[PDB]
Amino acid sequence: GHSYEKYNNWETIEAWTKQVTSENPDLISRTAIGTTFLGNNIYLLKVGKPGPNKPAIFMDCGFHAREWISHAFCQWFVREAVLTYGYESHMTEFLNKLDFYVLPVLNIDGYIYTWTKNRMWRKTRSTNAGTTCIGTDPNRNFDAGWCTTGASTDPCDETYCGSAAESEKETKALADFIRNNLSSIKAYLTIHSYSQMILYPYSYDYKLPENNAELNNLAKAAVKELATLYGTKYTYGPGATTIYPAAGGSDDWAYDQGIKYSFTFELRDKGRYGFILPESQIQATCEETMLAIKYVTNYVLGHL
Numbered sequence: 001g002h003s004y005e006k007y008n009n010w011e012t013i014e015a016w017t018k019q020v021t022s023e024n025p026d027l028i029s030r031t032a033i034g035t036t037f038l039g040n041n042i043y044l045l046k047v048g049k050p051g052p053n054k055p056a057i058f059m060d061c062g063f064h065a066r067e068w069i070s071h072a073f074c075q076w077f078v079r080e081a082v083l084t085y086g087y088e089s090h091m092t093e094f095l096n097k098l099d100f101y102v103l104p105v106l107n108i109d110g111y112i113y114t115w116t117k118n119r120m121w122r123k124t125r126s127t128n129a130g131t132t133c134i135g136t137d138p139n140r141n142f143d144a145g146w147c148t149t150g151a152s153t154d155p156c157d158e159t160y161c162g163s164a165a166e167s168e169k170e171t172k173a174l175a176d177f178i179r180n181n182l183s184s185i186k187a188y189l190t191i192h193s194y195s196q197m198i199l200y201p202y203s204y205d206y207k208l209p210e211n212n213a214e215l216n217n218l219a220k221a222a223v224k225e226l227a228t229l230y231g232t233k234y235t236y237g238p239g240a241t242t243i244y245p246a247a248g249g250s251d252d253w254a255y256d257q258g259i260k261y262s263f264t265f266e267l268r269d270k271g272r273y274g275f276i277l278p279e280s281q282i283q284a285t286c287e288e289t290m291l292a293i294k295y296v297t298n299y300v301l302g303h304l
């Protein structure tokens with residue numbers, strides 16, 4: 001029941017992670033890096049031609065449950081990789097020289113909830129002591145100016161930062177994996193919607209990253225590249241100023257770990273449909289986004 005041009009439920013995405021790996025063992029290995037609060041398997045796909053001591057790029061989707069185009073993009077990316085390897089010169093070099101760690105859905109519990117109960121759910125689905133309110137905002141749950149700004153300490157709010165950094169099994173699983181592979185991971189890319197933006201640090205503080213100049217130049221060329229296909233216009237810049245301040249973000253944390261190329265993508269649209277992006281825009285959205293991801297990849301690669 002899987003389709004790359006429709007939104008798939010978790011049942012179908014899970015089966016797909018198994019099948020796509022089955023059908024492409026020379027390009028994809030699949031592992032689980034942990035379990036969600038409700039016991040779902042946090043899958044990670046290692047996409048690339050296997051080899052000794054390869055550098056890597058890390059990309060996750062599905063941080064926020066209602067952001068369905070995000071989940072769709074990771075799936076799309078994986079097909080693009082496997083189908084074009086060996087035919088398209090750029091992707092062939094990419095997969096030859098590096099690995100993509102693709103985490104298709106981080107917040108699986110919430111994603112299932114958007115399908116079963118409330119399409120507009122954002123957070124995780126963990127319980128909170130002393131309240132009936134459910135969930136933590138995973139992108140306020142990382143150790144980066146944790147809960148200092150743009151975060152709520154109230155479990156009942158949508159930006160709840162949690163009881164403590166990495167209090168969520170999912171955010172902990174992700175941070176553990178990156179932490180264990182810091183030597184090989186060269187860039188971090190986290191996929192969200194909507195707003196049509198490429199964001200880079202900082203989000204938890206108005207301070208600029210050390211390599212701010214090249215990050216701006218990089219984000220700039222990527223949004224230019226993205227636009228060549230359908231004319232879709234992104235804005236870009238530091239998180240704090242480009243959209244709004246929000247501490248505890250995974251990209252800020254990734255950066256401060258030493259990953260110099262760290263980005264948050266906000267996909268289509270700009271509010272017409274918002275989180276409820278029609279399935280009819282899935283193809284065009286992923287297509288133009290592919291170009292920005294490959295532009296970044298090409299840049300990071302030539303900068304090892």
Ligand SMILES: CC(C)[C@H](NC(=O)OCc1ccccc1)P(=O)(O)C[C@H](C(=O)O)c1cccc(CN)c1
Binds near residue numbers: 158245
């Ligand atoms: C529509 C988008 C802009 C989404 N925002 C959203 O749904 O906000 C809900 C909200 C937030 C504060 C108050 C009220 C509602 P988003 O991808 O999720 C934005 C995302 C987030 O909030 O975690 C974000 C914002 C600023 C900087 C970063 C980089 N670390 C990431």
Ligand SMILES: [Zn+2]
Binds near residue numbers: 063064067192193
């Ligand atoms: Zn989001």
